[PDB]
Amino acid sequence: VNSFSGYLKLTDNVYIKNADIVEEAKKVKPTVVVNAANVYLKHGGGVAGALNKATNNAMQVESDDYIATNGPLKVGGSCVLSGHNLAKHCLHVVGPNVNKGEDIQLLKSAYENFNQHEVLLAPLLSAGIFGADPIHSLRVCVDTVRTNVYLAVFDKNLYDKLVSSFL
Numbered sequence: 001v002n003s004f005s006g007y008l009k010l011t012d013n014v015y016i017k018n019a020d021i022v023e024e025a026k027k028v029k030p031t032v033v034v035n036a037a038n039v040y041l042k043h044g045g046g047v048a049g050a051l052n053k054a055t056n057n058a059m060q061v062e063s064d065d066y067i068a069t070n071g072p073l074k075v076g077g078s079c080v081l082s083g084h085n086l087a088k089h090c091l092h093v094v095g096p097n098v099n100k101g102e103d104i105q106l107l108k109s110a111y112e113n114f115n116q117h118e119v120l121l122a123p124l125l126s127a128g129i130f131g132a133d134p135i136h137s138l139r140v141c142v143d144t145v146r147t148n149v150y151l152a153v154f155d156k157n158l159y160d161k162l163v164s165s166f167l
């Protein structure tokens with residue numbers, strides 16, 4: 001049993017809710033919150049910009065030190081950093097950004113990072129300003145992630161579409 005509330009069980013292991021991942025993180029304090037990161041960990045907009053703003057920029061400060069030491073992530077890759085006031089840990093995962101011309105096949109590799117964590121709160125990868133098909137991202141999630149994932153979907157109209165089209 002866990003404290004995630006009002007989630008629609010889609011499969012054995014995938015759950016979804018129309019909710020703000022920030023409030024959801026602030027309420028649940030999950031072991032892992034996933035960030036929709038880029039390779040430079042520059043949290044400018046979307047989930048990344050929103051989570052960073054909620055951490056009073058501490059996420060960005062930590063991320064800049066990470067990049068200075070380790071260099072950029074790979075598209076499809078991830079790193080584990082602090083969850084600050086939102087979670088124990090933040091799993092920064094880089095899905096492909098269609099608005100940068102990145103290969104959508106890398107979306108499966110991105111979701112594979114979730115399998116290293118037993119339970120996660122996460123956004124649907126490569127949705128919103130990343131420009132990939134969200135019905136597609138949800139399908140890849142369901143077909144790739146085997147651990148227990150709670151997807152918080154910010155946009156209500158996206159959520160309603162994701163529910164009504166899920167096979």
Ligand SMILES: O=C(N[C@H]1c2cccc(O)c2C[C@H]1C(=O)O)c1cnc(NC2CCOCC2)cn1
Pocket residue numbers: 020021022036045046047048050123124125126127128129130152153154155158
């Ligand atoms: O851009 C946001 N989400 C979309 C996005 C963007 C980029 C990559 C992605 O994978 C996704 C998933 C998609 C969604 O979930 O709809 C977002 C923005 N802000 C939020 N929280 C604020 C907290 C303070 O008050 C205002 C709201 C919560 N989500």
